[PDB]
Amino acid sequence: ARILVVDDIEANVRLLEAKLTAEYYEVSTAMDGPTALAMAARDLPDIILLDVMMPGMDGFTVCRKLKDDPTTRHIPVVLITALDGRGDRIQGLESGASDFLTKPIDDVMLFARVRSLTRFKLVIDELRQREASARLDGLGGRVLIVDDNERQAQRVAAELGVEHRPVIESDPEKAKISAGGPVDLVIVNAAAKNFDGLRFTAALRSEERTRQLPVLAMVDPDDRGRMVKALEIGVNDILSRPIDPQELSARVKTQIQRKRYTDYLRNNLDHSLELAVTDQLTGLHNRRYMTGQLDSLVKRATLGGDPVSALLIDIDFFKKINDTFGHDIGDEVLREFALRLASNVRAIDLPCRYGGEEFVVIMPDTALADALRIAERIRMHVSGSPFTVAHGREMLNVTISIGVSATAGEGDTPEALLKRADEGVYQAKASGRNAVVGK
Amino acid sequence: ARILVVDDIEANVRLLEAKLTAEYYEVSTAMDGPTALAMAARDLPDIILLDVMMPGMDGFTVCRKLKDDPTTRHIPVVLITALDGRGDRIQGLESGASDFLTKPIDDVMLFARVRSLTRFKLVIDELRQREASGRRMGAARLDGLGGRVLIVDDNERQAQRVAAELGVEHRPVIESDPEKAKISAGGPVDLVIVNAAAKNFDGLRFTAALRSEERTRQLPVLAMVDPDDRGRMVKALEIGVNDILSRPIDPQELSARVKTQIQRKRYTDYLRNNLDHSLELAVTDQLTGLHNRRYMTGQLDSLVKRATLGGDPVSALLIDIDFFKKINDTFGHDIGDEVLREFALRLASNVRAIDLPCRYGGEEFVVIMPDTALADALRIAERIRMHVSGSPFTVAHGREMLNVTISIGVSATAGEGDTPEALLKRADEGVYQAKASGRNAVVGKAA
Numbered sequence A: 001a002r003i004l005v006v007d008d009i010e011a012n013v014r015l016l017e018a019k020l021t022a023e024y025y026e027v028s029t030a031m032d033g034p035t036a037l038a039m040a041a042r043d044l045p046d047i048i049l050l051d052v053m054m055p056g057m058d059g060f061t062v063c064r065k066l067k068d069d070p071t072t073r074h075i076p077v078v079l080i081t082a083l084d085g086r087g088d089r090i091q092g093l094e095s096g097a098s099d100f101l102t103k104p105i106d107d108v109m110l111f112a113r114v115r116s117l118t119r120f121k122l123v124i125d126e127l128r129q130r131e132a133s134a135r136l137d138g139l140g141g142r143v144l145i146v147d148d149n150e151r152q153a154q155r156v157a158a159e160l161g162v163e164h165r166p167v168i169e170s171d172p173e174k175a176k177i178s179a180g181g182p183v184d185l186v187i188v189n190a191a192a193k194n195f196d197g198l199r200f201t202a203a204l205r206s207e208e209r210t211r212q213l214p215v216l217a218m219v220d221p222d223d224r225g226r227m228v229k230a231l232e233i234g235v236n237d238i239l240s241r242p243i244d245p246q247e248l249s250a251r252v253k254t255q256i257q258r259k260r261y262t263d264y265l266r267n268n269l270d271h272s273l274e275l276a277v278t279d280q281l282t283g284l285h286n287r288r289y290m291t292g293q294l295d296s297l298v299k300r301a302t303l304g305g306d307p308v309s310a311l312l313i314d315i316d317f318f319k320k321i322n323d324t325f326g327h328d329i330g331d332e333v334l335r336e337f338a339l340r341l342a343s344n345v346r347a348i349d350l351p352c353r354y355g356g357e358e359f360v361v362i363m364p365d366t367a368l369a370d371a372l373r374i375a376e377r378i379r380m381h382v383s384g385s386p387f388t389v390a391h392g393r394e395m396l397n398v399t400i401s402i403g404v405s406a407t408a409g410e411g412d413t414p415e416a417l418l419k420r421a422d423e424g425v426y427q428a429k430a431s432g433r434n435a436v437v438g439k
Numbered sequence B: 001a002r003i004l005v006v007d008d009i010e011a012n013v014r015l016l017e018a019k020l021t022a023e024y025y026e027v028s029t030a031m032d033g034p035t036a037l038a039m040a041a042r043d044l045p046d047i048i049l050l051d052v053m054m055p056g057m058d059g060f061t062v063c064r065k066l067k068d069d070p071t072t073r074h075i076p077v078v079l080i081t082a083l084d085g086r087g088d089r090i091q092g093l094e095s096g097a098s099d100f101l102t103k104p105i106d107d108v109m110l111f112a113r114v115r116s117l118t119r120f121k122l123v124i125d126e127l128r129q130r131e132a133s134g135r136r137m138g139a140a141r142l143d144g145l146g147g148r149v150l151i152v153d154d155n156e157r158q159a160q161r162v163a164a165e166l167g168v169e170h171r172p173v174i175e176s177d178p179e180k181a182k183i184s185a186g187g188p189v190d191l192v193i194v195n196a197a198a199k200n201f202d203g204l205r206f207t208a209a210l211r212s213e214e215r216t217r218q219l220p221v222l223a224m225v226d227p228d229d230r231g232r233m234v235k236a237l238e239i240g241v242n243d244i245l246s247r248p249i250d251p252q253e254l255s256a257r258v259k260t261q262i263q264r265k266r267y268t269d270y271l272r273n274n275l276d277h278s279l280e281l282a283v284t285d286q287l288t289g290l291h292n293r294r295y296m297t298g299q300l301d302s303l304v305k306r307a308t309l310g311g312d313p314v315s316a317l318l319i320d321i322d323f324f325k326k327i328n329d330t331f332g333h334d335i336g337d338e339v340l341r342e343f344a345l346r347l348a349s350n351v352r353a354i355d356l357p358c359r360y361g362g363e364e365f366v367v368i369m370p371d372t373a374l375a376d377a378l379r380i381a382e383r384i385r386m387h388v389s390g391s392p393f394t395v396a397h398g399r400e401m402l403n404v405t406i407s408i409g410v411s412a413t414a415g416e417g418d419t420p421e422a423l424l425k426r427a428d429e430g431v432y433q434a435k436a437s438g439r440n441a442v443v444g445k446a447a
């Protein structure tokens, strides 16, 4: 993940760059507003860490200008404030900040925030891609406060009561049940007295029903060990006590919006028919699945290595099957054909349904010479045995034409590889039927 | 998660029980074979940790008998072996063990194995539920063999040995360059075996790069680690490797861990690509965009259980559109579908996002309102009726206008022994009485 760090003092920038690079992050740096705005639009980073106090262009202005640009509006921005930054955080939210860090930088809080917002960036990126080809803000959620400190829980619920729908639970047993219902966020007190909030959190993560339910832990800043333990158990992010209203607002909004993005992408859009990856008739994968996998396969082959082979199989005279036996028997033949095809090719290969009665087999780490002999093996297994249909009442023979291609070259592309296999099929169809042709 | 620990010596059992309970596990104990087999069938634990050497019935026999019983065959079994336990691991795999631990027990290795196998147990449980449902209602590769395994290592002698060990049951591929490996890992790869102690690249940096990209974020990864360097082991597990392999690589350990990761992946992919996209397991109505009855039932179960324990009740609204056939008759089925889409938008806009406006039937909708009393639920239904009936529905790309009315039945969960079925049955009565006494009305039924 790529992080942009912005601070007027070079020593602050180098210190953060060293810490983040040690944790396997790709870090760029800027030391004033104009350069940071130019870098963000040019490089399009994943997260921006931004100091609020800089000469000339303050961080608030940089944040506002990042949200004005439509190409950088989606990039999470973290504002680094000072100890007493209540006013800064208030103006930070108005400027459009995602969350906050306070200096001097606490390493646990630093990486906790980065890890949370990088995961959010992943769903942000995915949602934008699908939108290019439903409540999606972070407000109005049911937030479950699990805490035995009444004064604290009531204060948290009051702060959350204007933007969300808060609910308090002192008993952990009742909280487990409520947490299994329509709950958007759980705020648990790590420093609880009558129950182990960390044990409670671990119970949530063990059950599949609640394994991905967002959890925020209220932690004591003196006890660093409990902070690390909570993050290890699987808490999404932590809130230092006493609870800051602006930090509470930001962190809750991030978790609820991340949840809604994920559920919308997985429950609605993934189950839609335009984005499906498996053919319902044959049970094989479709072209959408194949294209994604073939992209990486061809890219690796172009760098020098074992090539990728492609088999395009087309059933000969499939109309006649539908005309003589009916469309339902035709569907029986396609299902039985798909079973035979997958059974006689490696599970590491990609036998997919390419067209209506056309199939594709992508064979990684395979050369053209072998692919031609493999196509011959496939043809003999599907054409050598008859297809029994109509609950055993009818027997039918089938023949197929195959076109074969392999990825040889530095600038080869998935489209060129398949276009070369198409020609194989068209030439195999022209010169009779039941043949293999390699181009 | 519930773990069963089996050892003949009590001190060994208490030591493991203490370590595991400290990590928030529910631990049961047995001190001989017969007792462990009886406990396993009765309690059905999630993981069994089993000593190989016990008087009378050894661990190997217990493992074999666990796999013979069809009710416990699915429970992963970990065998605790000795130092030179090559024979133990060979005989363990023959007995049907899932994986192994070596004594003296290493806490890092202990929790790595348990965490790995508990996640596998989750998918196992889900697959078995779906298979139970399919049996009541009346062909993919689900073993752990034959996978494409990507070995990312610059040590030639090690990589060649690993590839040879994997070359009999799987399809191994070696990659020295981490850049080329990053690309291959995004294709049809079932497992990545990376060398944490590499010389020309940081295998742990490589692993973190895999986890950062969405394409490869859940790709199973095994890390080959040095047992001397405890810090690197913990760091690899923190980065997100699925499990670790101690060097030099044990053939039986390599076989076990690879099978576990590959089978877990195939279970997950089958459950998410095939079965989740089927109509029996969907949770969102594709037409209206609301959730459906399957989703509602799951959520309502927890909601009612909490209400029965004493607290704010749960209310239920059943909305049925009046004279929907006439819409289909006059304007056609496609305009009818437009009305349903527009109705769902109005319904969701006029209830809280914490509420559950779902498509209950064909033209029947349900609104589950948690922490809500009957008196308020009745006034909310009145709000809904006025918003749907007060404004006409624009259909046919703006060319046609239509009026719609709805009948609503309202109920709330009052009582300790109330059930979701009774709650909805009381709302059904409301709807049926609202239909009988004219249309465009709301009727409430209290217990």
Ligand SMILES: Nc1nc2c(ncn2[C@@H]2O[C@@H]3COP(=O)(O)O[C@H]4[C@@H](O)[C@H](n5cnc6c(=O)[nH]c(N)nc65)O[C@@H]4COP(=O)(O)O[C@H]3[C@H]2O)c(=O)[nH]1
Binding pocket: A344, A345, A346, A349, A363, A364, A365, A366, A370, A374
């Ligand atoms: N992606 C893909 N490539 C294929 C397939 N069939 C053959 N090839 C490629 O062609 C090479 C020669 O395979 P073979 O002549 O049939 O001679 C093979 C074959 O007789 C046998 N073999 C390997 N795997 C299998 C298998 O899964 N089933 C059977 N019956 N024999 C296998 O071992 C011989 C050597 O195999 P390899 O060294 O791996 O090298 C193989 C492989 O790279 C396939 O179905 N899918």
Ligand SMILES: Nc1nc2c(ncn2[C@@H]2O[C@@H]3COP(=O)(O)O[C@H]4[C@@H](O)[C@H](n5cnc6c(=O)[nH]c(N)nc65)O[C@@H]4COP(=O)(O)O[C@H]3[C@H]2O)c(=O)[nH]1
Binding pocket: A343, A344, A345, A346, A347, A348, A377, B145, B146, B167, B168, B169, B170, B171
């Ligand atoms: N002539 C030839 N045919 C190939 C080859 N590779 C795959 N096939 C064909 O495709 C079938 C499925 O192989 P698989 O899916 O990888 O699933 C295979 C594979 O996982 C394993 N297997 C069999 N032989 C070998 C082998 O030589 N090396 C490895 N690594 N696995 C093998 O057993 C499974 C069942 O294999 P089969 O029953 O024989 O049935 C095989 C075989 O008919 C090949 O290289 N040459």
Ligand SMILES: Nc1nc2c(ncn2[C@@H]2O[C@@H]3COP(=O)(O)O[C@H]4[C@@H](O)[C@H](n5cnc6c(=O)[nH]c(N)nc65)O[C@@H]4COP(=O)(O)O[C@H]3[C@H]2O)c(=O)[nH]1
Binding pocket: B350, B351, B352, B355, B369, B370, B371, B372, B376, B380
């Ligand atoms: N699950 C669910 N329950 C509902 C709904 N509408 C009303 N209630 C329940 O009935 C209580 C009274 O709501 P009200 O009479 O309109 O009197 C309300 C209302 O005037 C206002 N209010 C709260 N949230 C909203 C809102 O989202 N939009 C508007 N326009 N007013 C709201 O604050 C008053 C007190 O509300 P509450 O304290 O929360 O206590 C509410 C709430 O518990 C609903 O749509 N869904």
Ligand SMILES: Nc1nc2c(ncn2[C@@H]2O[C@@H]3COP(=O)(O)O[C@H]4[C@@H](O)[C@H](n5cnc6c(=O)[nH]c(N)nc65)O[C@@H]4COP(=O)(O)O[C@H]3[C@H]2O)c(=O)[nH]1
Binding pocket: A139, A140, A160, A161, A162, A163, A164, A165, B349, B350, B351, B352, B353, B354
């Ligand atoms: N914590 C809190 N948030 C508030 C309040 N007032 C408005 N909001 C927030 O602002 C969103 C829009 O509410 P609305 O425009 O009045 O339009 C609302 C309103 O028309 C109706 N509604 C929801 N609750 C109530 C209620 O309690 N009383 C009445 N009369 N209507 C409600 O449903 C619409 C959607 O409400 P939501 O889905 O939850 O989405 C609401 C909610 O997130 C409040 O008093 N307390």
Ligand SMILES: Nc1nc2c(ncn2[C@@H]2O[C@H](COP(=O)(O)OP(=O)(O)O)[C@@H](OP(=O)(O)OP(=O)(O)O)[C@H]2O)c(=O)[nH]1
Binding pocket: A281, A314, A315, A316, A317, A318, A319, A320, A322, A323, A326, A327, A328, A329, A330, A331, A334, A355, A356, A357
């Ligand atoms: N039973 C069945 N047949 C399929 C399916 N997909 C395509 N068909 C059909 O395959 C037939 C084409 O077969 P070929 O005759 O070999 O086509 P080709 O010239 O390109 O090689 C078309 O006949 P058709 O009579 O026009 O079929 P249809 O239009 O009624 O679906 C086409 O509609 C399918 O999923 N199930």
Ligand SMILES: Nc1nc2c(ncn2[C@@H]2O[C@H](COP(=O)(O)OP(=O)(O)O)[C@@H](OP(=O)(O)OP(=O)(O)O)[C@H]2O)c(=O)[nH]1
Binding pocket: B320, B321, B322, B323, B324, B325, B326, B328, B332, B333, B334, B335, B336, B337, B340, B361, B362, B363
């Ligand atoms: N456009 C559309 N209409 C739906 C859908 N689901 C149900 N309908 C309607 O639900 C109706 C069932 O009758 P009710 O709606 O309960 O009786 P009512 O009109 O008095 O309230 C179906 O009657 P039907 O006319 O006999 O069935 P149909 O021929 O319209 O499909 C059907 O019109 C849907 O998904 N899309």
Ligand SMILES: [Mg+2]
Binding pocket: A008, A009, A051, A052, A053, A054
């Ligand atoms: Mg400054």
Ligand SMILES: [Mg+2]
Binding pocket: A314, A315, A316, A317, A318, A357
């Ligand atoms: Mg054809």
Ligand SMILES: [Mg+2]
Binding pocket: B008, B009, B051, B053, B054
């Ligand atoms: Mg012993």
Ligand SMILES: [Mg+2]
Binding pocket: B320, B321, B322, B323, B324, B363
């Ligand atoms: Mg109706």
